[PDB]
Amino acid sequence: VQLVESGGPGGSCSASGFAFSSFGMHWVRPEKGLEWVAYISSGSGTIYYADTVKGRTISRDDPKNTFLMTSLRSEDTAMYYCVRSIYYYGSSPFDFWGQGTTLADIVMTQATSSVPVTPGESVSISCRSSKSLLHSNGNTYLYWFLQRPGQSPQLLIYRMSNLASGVPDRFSGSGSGTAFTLTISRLEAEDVVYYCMQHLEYPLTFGAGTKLEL
Amino acid sequence: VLRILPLVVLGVTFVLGVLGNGLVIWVAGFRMTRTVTTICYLNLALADFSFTATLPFLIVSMAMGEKWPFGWFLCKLIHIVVDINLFGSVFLIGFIALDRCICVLHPVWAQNHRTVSLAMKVIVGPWILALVLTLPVFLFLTTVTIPNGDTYCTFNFASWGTPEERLKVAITMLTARIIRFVIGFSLPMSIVAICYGLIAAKIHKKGMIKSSRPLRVLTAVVASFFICWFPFQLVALLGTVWLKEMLFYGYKIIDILVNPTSSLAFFNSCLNPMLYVFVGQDFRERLIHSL
Amino acid sequence: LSAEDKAAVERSKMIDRNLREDGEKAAREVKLLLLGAGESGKSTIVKQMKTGIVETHFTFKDLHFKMFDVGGQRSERKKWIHCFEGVTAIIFCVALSYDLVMHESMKLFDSICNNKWFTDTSIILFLNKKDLFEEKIKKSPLTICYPEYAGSNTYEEAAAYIQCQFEDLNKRKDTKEIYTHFTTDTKNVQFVFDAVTDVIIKNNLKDCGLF
Amino acid sequence: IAQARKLVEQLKMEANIDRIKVSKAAADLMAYCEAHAKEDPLLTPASENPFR
Amino acid sequence: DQLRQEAEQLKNQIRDARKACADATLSQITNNIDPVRIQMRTRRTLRGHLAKIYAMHWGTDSRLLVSASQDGKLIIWDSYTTNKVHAIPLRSSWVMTCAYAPSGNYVACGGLDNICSIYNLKTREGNVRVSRELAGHTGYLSCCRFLDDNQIVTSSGDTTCALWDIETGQQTTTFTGHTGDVMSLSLAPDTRLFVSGACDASAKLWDVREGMCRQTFTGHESDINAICFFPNGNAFATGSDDATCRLFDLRADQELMTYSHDNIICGITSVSFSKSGRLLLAGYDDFNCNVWDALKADRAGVLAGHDNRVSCLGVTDDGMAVATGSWDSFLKIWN
Ligand SMILES: CCCCCCCCCCCCCCCCCCCC(=O)N[C@@H](CO)[C@H](O)CCCCCCCCCCCCCCC
């Protein structure tokens, strides 16, 4: 519940307040958008790196409760973000998004950015994905993150229907198959861009994002 | 006799071993909680089961006149299995003897540091040693075609052909393979005898030898490992020290008796379950309730 | 197949390994009951060791003993006594020194020794208040509780008869061994250690087939 | 004694309780079974159960 | 004195009133009812317990289940994938009961330590930690059952039951009418009444609101170990160490049907009903569980999949399973 980390040409998460040793960890990447960086699970068993930066490194220490690339690629100039995700039944993966620092596969298209919205009115945000996001177990995977200006992202609707702790009960998300949506009933001042997320496959693509002007 | 009884004994050992080892791997294997003793018994049962599965090939080969009607790959694989698992059995017998000795003589240690994890991480040591000692079986064995076309199944050194050096390497690498005895009888028989005599002495001096169970089954195991392995390790020891007089001249007594003592040696594989696993009352009750 | 359930089976296997590791160090400490009538110094013996169920753990020669005292529970004994099936041994306390009846303790031993949950669990009997018994038996005959026989009125005789009776309460003699004792006795925990080591050796011989 | 009085009151409170004939109670028992067991899986399975 | 005569007169009045209402027994009334022979089977084995299993409880979502075992382990499983979700290390391994709160946030445990430990599952931190320790109970816990996320009832061999207030931590109602040891406990669906079967061979229906016993039934010869509500709320069946189960109706206040067979001479340890209140499932300690048609009082199924005493069993609220935990250290889910 408290993730702060530090960091920064050519060459190349002090987690606290929670049981790190039983949590998965990711990283997520310019004032344009966000994209996936790496992955690790509890016990350092399964590690997926991002296809765009495959094999160039994520590593964790549980007793220290905390480490992270080799080449300063042009696309690597971005703001990297630190998240936790415990994967068990009924959990809320990607629950906590850290502040972050500065430095084929399913893709989601939104193309709905720049929707002007007024307080008190209801708003909806669309999200179109390439293939279906529904594993055979019954779960639709989409994690509606809200990025309030000048702040870390936050989880609103994990697994495309469930609602995470702290989120007021006005938020709600739905949508099946490939095209998804997020709904706000009674918008408030502290609800001013929205980011999708797939989790069926290892590459954690996001989608563009829809800024709500206020 | 001396040409028929070995086949009968080998067949009886084969069938009894298949049945008993299957029982051990089905009752102690699946239908019993996993403990160090169960690990040792299951590994020994698996060793003897692989050996007795290879056994029908050996009995066919002996009955058909020391030949190999089966394919080259079949004979190579079967001899690899026999060499790996005979050593596996004769080493896991010693391993279980060591386990019992360290559980009776030193019970405090055997409770503080004898878990299933250590049992599984050390039980493969005998298998590794068996692989090391069976590599000279895969390395230097191939089907050999007789001039009469009989195509027997023996060793060969054509891959290494100058008759002087070839025959020298042949003799030296066949008298090097002393190992069947020094690490196939001396080590296992020594371990079994020493450890089980020690536990008999400990459970006599301390007392608590109540019924006629302990001194019966504790000498039955040493006897069943001796009276069923020693003739092989005398005949083969003699052969390995009389290779010359048997390979150049035709001491035909030693070769005239290899099949009988071979059957007696293989009988131990079938006897082992009836001596390590079925004796315990808990296993007997578990088997009875299982089927 | 699996999308993030693949990351759930990872957590499952991690905590399953943790459970197995705990069991390795859980089946490492020898469990040991403690009973008695209540006047017997079970408190005394637990005090001399180098509400609800009381837990006591100690060490001796690198063997971790864990004693369970339940006499604090004044409930039906036939309901919490089966939980202690796997105890290696049962330390029983009987006071040699006739305030009310002693006969109650003898009835208790028959209810513990012959109990169906303890057919193979050895009982370390403990006759306490030996000094008080010696200083008492002179002043009062042993017939007041043992009409059958009192014998010689010296401690080395009357206590011998009490011990003989308590051994005679063994409804079974093949399996259970009653490692009786007397207890300032400083060699007591050593006696418990010897009895427990003997029981462990017997169990190892039992599941190794030699019994 | 006081315990006797407490027991007397404890039985007294249970004296005046209303009861119904066991025919009606058993009728309710079998009504709640028959009119609600069309959904019970352990009786009539779960054609595609989640424990496959 | 006169009260003893008065007590005998009151007991005779109770007995006569009870005898008056006996219009008919389940035999004649239910003779025109078809028997269920169900035979469930192991769909999942839940291994990981290294000692005896005494407690289990089914989650409200019919998905998770909690098991308390002598391993000092309270495992929260996943019934489908079998992947273990949580492994709570109990601080007192002598556990005899556990309960899974209706909201899934909390899980109950308790035992010879006679402390009802309420553990918190859903927290910001990943781990599962103990929320409350309900103490002040001079027996041994035998069954905990949540009413809401703030009220739980605990029964003990303290001849007493109790309704607590998990917030303040102080017993807010004491249910003391019994004379032996209270071994079982179960809540009505209304969460306004609950039954407790004790070692007095008697069962008792209590009142959580008024704070006072309501009904006492006596139909058994020895200790009672299990009692569970018929899902309609006004009936409950129970099992005793005398190898008999009996059905009671709270309004009828009499015994209704008996469930026993001559061959079985073992004991009983847990009793639970089906979703529809048609299958009476009981955990006997002859190393297997039994399944009856409560209405027809006929043996109908056996869950023989254990090598030791079947201690606890439970049925999902969805009704599409039954989980039995025996002393064989293995949970088993049947469907
Ligand atoms: C171009 C020219 C090419 C060559 C032409 C011929 C070469 C010139 C003649 C050479 C003779 C060989 C070739 C003749 C073909 C066979 C005829 C008889 C040969 C013969 O006498 N064979 C004897 C000894 O060699 C016997 O069959 C050997 C068996 C293996 C040794 C192990 C000892 C027994 C142990 C049994 C269990 C072991 C496994 C358990 C291990 C623990």
Side-chain angles (χ1 to χ4, degrees), chain A residues 1 3-28 30 33-35 37-41 43-60 62-63 66-69 71 78 80-94 96-102 104-113 115-120 122-130 132-134 136-147 149-150 152-159 162-168 170-175 177 179-185 187 189 192-200 203-210 212 214, chain B residues 6 11 15 17-18 20-25 28-30 32-47 49-53 56-59 63 65 69-73 77-82 84-114 116-120 122-130 132 134 136-137 141 144-145 147 149 152-158 161-163 168 170 172-185 187-207 213-215 217-223 225-226 228-233 235-236 238-239 241-242 248-250 258 260-261 264-269 271-273 275-280 283 286, chain C residues 1-23 25-28 30-38 41-46 48-49 51-61 63-73 75 77 79-98 101-103 105 108-109 111-113 115-119 121-129 132-133 135-137 141 144 147 150-151 155 158-163 165-167 169-170 172-173 175-176 178-183 186 188-201 203-205 207-211, chain D residues 2 4 11 13 15 17 19 25-27 31-32 35-37 39 41-47 50-51, chain E residues 1 7 14 17-22 24 26 29 33-36 40 42-70 72-78 80-112 114-147 149-155 157 159-169 171-189 191 193-199 201-209 211-220 222-226 228-231 233-245 247-252 256 258 260-264 266-269 271-274 277-286 288-292 294-295 297 299-306 308-317 319-325 327 329-335:
Chain A
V1 304
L3 310 182
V4 56
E5 65 274 16
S6 85
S12 35
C13 300
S14 64
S16 71
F18 68 105
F20 186 92
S21 186
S22 70
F23 270 15
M25 293 281 320
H26 315 267
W27 303 75
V28 174
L34 311 189
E35 62 94 22
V37 169
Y39 171 85
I40 191 166
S41 46
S44 297
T46 62
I47 297 89
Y48 311 151
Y49 283 99
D51 49 59
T52 187
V53 295
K54 182 62 66 68
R56 184 146 68 70
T57 174
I58 202 172
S59 56
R60 78 193 287 196
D62 304 355
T66 293
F67 284 111
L68 186 39
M69 301 290 251
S71 302
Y80 292 110
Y81 282 2
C82 179
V83 298
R84 54 180 221 172
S85 55
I86 188 168
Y87 293 98
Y88 63 92
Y89 169 78
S91 70
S92 70
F94 289 65
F96 196 58
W97 270 68
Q99 293 333 309
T101 61
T102 58
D105 62 17
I106 296 187
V107 65
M108 281 135 278
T109 61
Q110 290 155 271
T112 319
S113 181
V115 166
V117 65
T118 184
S122 159
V123 71
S124 307
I125 299 301
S126 51
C127 194
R128 185 179 296 113
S129 64
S130 81
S132 179
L133 298 196
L134 185 136
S136 176
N137 59 11
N139 307 122
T140 175
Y141 299 65
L142 191 89
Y143 298 71
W144 270 118
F145 295 125
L146 179 146
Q147 195 174 7
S152 179
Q154 168 190 122
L155 200 155
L156 308 154
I157 297 298
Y158 64 92
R159 274 191 220 84
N162 296 329
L163 188 153
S165 80
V167 176
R170 64 211 181 221
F171 295 78
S172 295
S174 77
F180 313 147
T181 179
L182 176 67
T183 61
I184 299 189
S185 190
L187 188 153
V192 187
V193 59
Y194 293 9
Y195 291 165
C196 297
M197 211 205 68
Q198 72 94 22
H199 207 283
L200 277 296
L204 298 173
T205 52
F206 287 175
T210 79
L212 275 75
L214 186 57
Chain B
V15 61
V18 167
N21 295 355
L23 265 294
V24 178
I25 62 170
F30 297 158
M32 167 166 310
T33 186
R34 205 63 82 210
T35 183
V36 178
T37 304
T38 296
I39 297 298
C40 290
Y41 292 168
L42 163 55
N43 279 274
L44 184 136
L46 183 63
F49 184 88
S50 295
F51 159 73
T52 185
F57 304 80
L58 265 296
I59 69 154
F70 292 163
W72 162 87
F73 171 76
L77 177 64
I78 289 309
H79 286 288
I80 297 169
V81 161
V82 161
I84 195 75
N85 298 120
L86 210 65
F87 282 18
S89 167
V90 72
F91 284 133
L92 288 193
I93 290 281
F95 187 78
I96 295 184
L98 266 175
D99 176 87
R100 305 219 181 118
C101 176
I102 209 162
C103 281
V104 170
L105 280 192
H106 216 302
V108 175
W109 183 98
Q111 198 186 13
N112 267 347
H113 315 322
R114 196 196 86 139
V116 181
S117 66
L118 189 59
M120 297 208 47
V122 189
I123 194 73
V124 308
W127 300 108
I128 288 300
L129 185 48
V132 176
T134 194
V137 183
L141 165 66
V144 160
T145 304
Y152 278 150
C153 185
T154 61
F155 293 85
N156 197 5
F157 298 81
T162 68
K168 192 54 168 53
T172 189
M173 185 64 72
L174 216 56
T175 188
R177 173 224 185 70
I178 281 185
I179 186 167
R180 185 176 318 160
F181 175 84
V182 65
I183 313 297
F185 204 72
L187 183 63
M189 197 39 197
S190 78
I191 293 299
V192 161
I194 291 309
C195 283
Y196 278 6
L198 281 197
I199 62 170
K202 175 73 150 38
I203 76 156
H204 202 264
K205 184 222 71 193
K206 180 263 300 170
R213 284 311 301 310
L215 277 296
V217 72
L218 185 54
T219 67
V221 53
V222 192
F225 190 81
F226 187 82
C228 290
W229 257 119
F230 179 59
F232 206 103
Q233 294 325 282
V235 169
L238 285 151
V241 288
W242 291 2
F248 293 170
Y249 294 98
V258 63
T261 181
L264 183 63
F266 305 151
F267 182 76
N268 185 22
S269 179
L271 192 173
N272 275 347
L275 184 63
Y276 278 79
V277 176
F278 294 134
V279 165
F283 182 76
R286 184 53 54 82
Chain C
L1 267 187
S2 299
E4 65 183 1
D5 291 331
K6 179 148 47 79
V9 69
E10 208 166 316
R11 174 177 180 79
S12 169
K13 294 212 311 313
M14 281 275 308
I15 68 174
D16 183 339
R17 184 212 299 156
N18 277 338
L19 292 198
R20 204 211 321 300
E21 183 178 1
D22 282 12
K25 65 178 72 66
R28 214 171 51 171
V30 62
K31 296 183 290 294
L32 190 141
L33 268 173
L34 165 67
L35 307 161
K42 65 178 72 66
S43 58
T44 305
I45 67 166
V46 295
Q48 63 84 30
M49 271 309 145
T51 186
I53 182 168
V54 177
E55 294 293 328
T56 302
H57 63 87
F58 53 101
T59 65
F60 212 71
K61 314 332 181 63
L63 179 46
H64 295 282
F65 293 85
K66 184 161 279 293
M67 199 176 325
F68 313 116
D69 171 358
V70 182
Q73 298 217 357
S75 47
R77 194 151 60 51
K79 287 296 178 42
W80 56 262
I81 202 53
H82 60 62
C83 291
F84 301 102
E85 180 65 26
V87 286
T88 293
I90 306 186
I91 289 187
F92 207 93
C93 303
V94 159
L96 303 159
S97 89
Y98 317 120
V101 291
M102 181 55 208
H103 280 88
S105 296
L108 191 51
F109 209 85
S111 66
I112 301 299
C113 182
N115 203 314
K116 64 163 149 304
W117 302 120
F118 295 132
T119 66
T121 78
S122 307
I123 290 179
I124 316 187
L125 179 143
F126 269 84
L127 294 174
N128 308 68
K129 288 332 166 186
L132 275 296
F133 184 80
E135 293 179 353
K136 193 184 213 139
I137 201 68
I144 58 188
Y155 153 74
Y161 186 42
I162 293 185
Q163 183 178 182
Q165 263 190 29
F166 273 102
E167 311 293 30
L169 272 296
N170 264 17
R172 274 171 61 51
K173 292 269 220 305
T175 64
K176 304 184 47 47
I178 314 293
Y179 309 84
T180 185
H181 204 80
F182 292 75
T183 186
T186 302
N188 184 345
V189 65
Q190 167 85 40
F191 184 84
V192 189
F193 169 54
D194 291 331
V196 166
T197 298
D198 192 321
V199 175
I200 287 160
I201 284 177
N203 300 342
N204 281 341
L205 288 160
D207 63 340
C208 279
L210 282 72
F211 279 169
Chain D
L11 282 71
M13 63 179 178
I17 301 299
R19 294 81 171 261
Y32 181 93
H36 194 288
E39 190 276 331
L42 294 181
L43 278 184
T44 74
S47 298
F51 290 108
Chain E
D1 202 60
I14 287 296
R18 217 82 75 73
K19 180 67 174 66
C21 316
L26 270 73
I29 299 296
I33 284 298
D34 292 331
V36 302
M40 291 65 88
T42 311
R43 295 294 179 60
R44 273 94 165 90
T45 187
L46 280 63
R47 59 191 64 246
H49 281 301
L50 308 153
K52 292 181 181 180
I53 282 175
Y54 298 108
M56 61 79 70
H57 202 198
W58 264 115
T60 314
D61 47 6
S62 161
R63 168 74 174 244
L64 304 194
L65 65 89
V66 63
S67 79
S69 172
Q70 301 259 78
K73 284 312 161 43
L74 190 72
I75 304 179
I76 285 145
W77 301 77
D78 183 358
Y80 302 149
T81 300
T82 305
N83 46 358
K84 308 199 258 287
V85 164
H86 288 117
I88 311 165
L90 313 172
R91 67 184 68 188
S92 179
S93 57
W94 302 111
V95 55
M96 306 190 46
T97 187
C98 84
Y100 197 110
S103 81
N105 297 294
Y106 304 90
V107 63
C109 170
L112 291 200
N114 50 62
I115 314 288
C116 181
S117 62
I118 306 300
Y119 292 97
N120 197 342
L121 302 194
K122 294 181 176 67
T123 57
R124 299 310 291 160
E125 311 76 60
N127 67 15
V128 163
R129 65 161 161 289
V130 55
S131 59
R132 261 287 177 184
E133 294 199 7
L134 311 170
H137 212 187
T138 62
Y140 63 91
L141 288 174
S142 305
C143 193
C144 316
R145 282 301 177 266
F146 276 80
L147 281 75
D149 291 331
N150 186 56
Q151 289 187 327
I152 189 167
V153 287
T154 55
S155 77
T159 327
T160 56
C161 298
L163 188 145
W164 306 71
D165 186 74
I166 320 183
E167 182 65 26
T168 192
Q171 180 179 180
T172 190
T173 302
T174 305
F175 291 128
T176 187
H178 271 290
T179 182
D181 278 21
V182 184
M183 271 318 297
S184 174
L185 177 136
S186 160
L187 264 56
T191 72
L193 300 174
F194 78 101
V195 291
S196 82
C199 286
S202 61
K204 269 191 216 280
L205 161 75
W206 304 75
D207 181 298
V208 301
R209 275 198 253 281
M212 61 79 71
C213 182
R214 214 191 91 161
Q215 293 168 215
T216 300
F217 308 154
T218 61
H220 274 160
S222 173
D223 286 13
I224 296 169
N225 295 84
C228 170
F229 261 103
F230 191 90
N234 64 7
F236 79 115
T238 180
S240 307
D241 273 333
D242 72 37
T244 317
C245 280
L247 193 153
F248 290 117
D249 205 307
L250 301 180
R251 291 160 330 160
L256 277 296
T258 187
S260 78
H261 208 256
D262 277 353
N263 71 333
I264 62 170
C266 54
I268 316 176
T269 302
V271 163
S272 293
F273 269 114
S274 159
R278 172 69 164 182
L279 281 192
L280 176 80
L281 284 53
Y284 294 76
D285 67 348
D286 61 339
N288 62 16
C289 171
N290 261 313
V291 175
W292 272 283
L295 281 63
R299 184 176 177 87
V302 180
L303 267 54
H306 275 113
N308 219 341
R309 295 171 30 130
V310 171
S311 175
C312 53
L313 64 89
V315 161
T316 78
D317 308 63
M320 206 172 318
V322 54
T324 77
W327 298 10
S329 315
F330 298 154
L331 283 166
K332 290 185 103 74
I333 301 185
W334 317 71
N335 195 339

